[PDB]
């Protein structure tokens, strides 16, 4: 069968500015080439078919190029709105395949977290175990550093993480970080607090709580 | 006008048998061939199967030779896929796709289902804990949330006030606890003011465990 390879695979460039997608063929698939994009939780959507033509609707700043083995897809100026992942696939011989994807996301200008500390409560302290949640809202560049502190004591190993997909009309992200302890260990402690570090911020912040 | 609405996901035992449907319409769908695609979580897409218009002529991939049969009831409008002896490897979403060319040479694929995930384990259904995300006891802007807690499988929905919450609202990606349940948090942030004018409720909805939950967040 024949193997789509795409390059790059992650590309992040700001608004306004060019992207080029390309996608080689391991071998001849003439102009048999589609583009697709998918968002997060979505189906792909048919951006260009047979190489070098846009699918009904699609805007014009998406165009197609190539043959043979080499093709490009182009976005001629990014909007936020086109965060996504965008695929090639091949329809000149069974079985039709994709490629793996290029990744591109939006870059936009630095944003600090809005930190927010919530404790647990006591709908779930009736039940042994305690989640402390800590949110980051609404910030880029993607790359945060949050430690948990309880007492002052650093905590290690008893936290998870969650980052949003980049927000579709601003660009930045949100990240969820929860603690887990058992309610005795929660119970046996008084001061909980969640220490961000972020390119938006001149210093780390920390948001904190008093059990009680 | 053209829409692919697709049925039949969820949990299923390795080792076991699923079937999955696509009602179509906007279009003639005897017309089109029609093709089912998956894509495994985190992963990319694979072309699963195809199926001409009328139609008498089928195409699967290697990997699902023998035991995946894809099949149409052009009376009804509709497509299946009815998939036995399951692995965790089929574990994906799996969408509906119509061919934007018509007779059945290869396709490129002009419309899509919206996908629906099966999940192929052995683990039991469990429905979810929901708690209130609320502080201490702050700014002009205040961040509400629940905590979706301990649930399998994927995945759960939240909305806020029924729907007619969404500026704001931030759900986030579920994560495999160690106990192998899945936990979220949603969260809004709102103004401080409509916290003592508005009510806030958030709505889960896990359908594999037919649980639906409504949890008023209030300032504790």
């Known amino acids: 069968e024949i193997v789509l390879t795409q390059s790059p695979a992650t590309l992040s460039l700001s608004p306004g500015e060019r992207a080029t997608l390309s996608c080689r063929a391991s071998?001849?698939?003439?102009?048999?080439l589609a583009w697709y994009q998918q968002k997060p939780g979505q189906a792909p959507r048919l951006l260009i078919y047979?190489?070098?033509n846009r699918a009904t609707g699609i805007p014009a700043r998406f165009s197609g190029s190539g043959s043979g083995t080499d093709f490009t897809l182009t976005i001629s100026s990014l909007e936020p709105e086109d965060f996504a992942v965008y695929y090639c696939?091949?329809?000149?011989?069974?079985?039709?395949?994709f490629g793996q994807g290029t990744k591109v996301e939006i870059k936009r200008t630095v944003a600090a977290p809005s930190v927010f500390i919530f404790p647990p409560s006591d709908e779930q302290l009736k039940s042994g175990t305690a989640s402390v949640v800590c949110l980051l809202n609404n910030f880029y560049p993607r790359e945060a550093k949050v430690q948990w502190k309880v007492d002052n004591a650093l905590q290690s190993g008893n936290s998870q993480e969650s980052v949003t997909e980049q927000d579709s009309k601003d660009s930045t992200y949100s990240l969820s970080s929860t603690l887990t302890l058992s309610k005795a260990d929660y119970e046996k402690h008084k001061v909980y607090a969640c220490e961000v570090t972020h390119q938006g911020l001149s210093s780390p912040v920390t948001k904190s709580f008093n059990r009680g | 006008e053209v829409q692919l609405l697709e049925s039949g996901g969820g949990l299923v035992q390795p080792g076991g048998s699923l079937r999955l449907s696509c009602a179509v319409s906007?279009?003639?769908?005897?017309?089109?061939?029609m093709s089912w695609v998956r894509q495994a979580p985190g992963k990319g897409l694979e072309w699963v199967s195809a199926?001409?218009?009328?139609?008498?002529?089928?195409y699967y991939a290697d990997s699902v030779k023998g035991r995946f049969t894809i099949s149409r009831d052009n009376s009804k409008n509709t497509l299946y896929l009815q998939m036995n002896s399951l692995r965790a490897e089929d574990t994906a979403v799996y969408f509906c796709?119509?061919?934007?060319?018509?007779?059945?040479?290869?396709?490129?694929?002009?419309?899509w289902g919206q996908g629906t995930l099966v999940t192929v384990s052995s683990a039991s259904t469990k429905g979810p804990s929901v708690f209130p995300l609320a502080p201490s006891s702050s700014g002009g802007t205040a961040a509400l949330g629940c905590l979706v807690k301990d649930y399998f499988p994927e995945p759960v929905t939240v909305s806020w006030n029924s729907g007619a919450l969404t500026s704001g609202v931030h759900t986030f990606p579920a994560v495999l606890q160690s106990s192998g349940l899945y936990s979220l948090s949603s969260v809004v942030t709102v103004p401080s003011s409509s916290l003592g004018t508005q009510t806030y409720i958030c709505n889960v909805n896990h359908k594999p465990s037919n649980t639906k939950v409504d949890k008023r967040v209030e300032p504790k």
């Open positions: 796709a119509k061919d934007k060319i018509l007779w059945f040479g290869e396709p490129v694929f002009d419309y």
């Open positions: 906007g279009f003639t769908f005897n017309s089109f061939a």
């Open positions: 199926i001409s218009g009328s139609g008498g002529g089928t």
């Open positions: 071998q001849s698939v003439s102009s048999y």
């Open positions: 047979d190489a070098s």
């Open positions: 696939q091949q329809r000149s011989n069974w079985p039709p395949t």
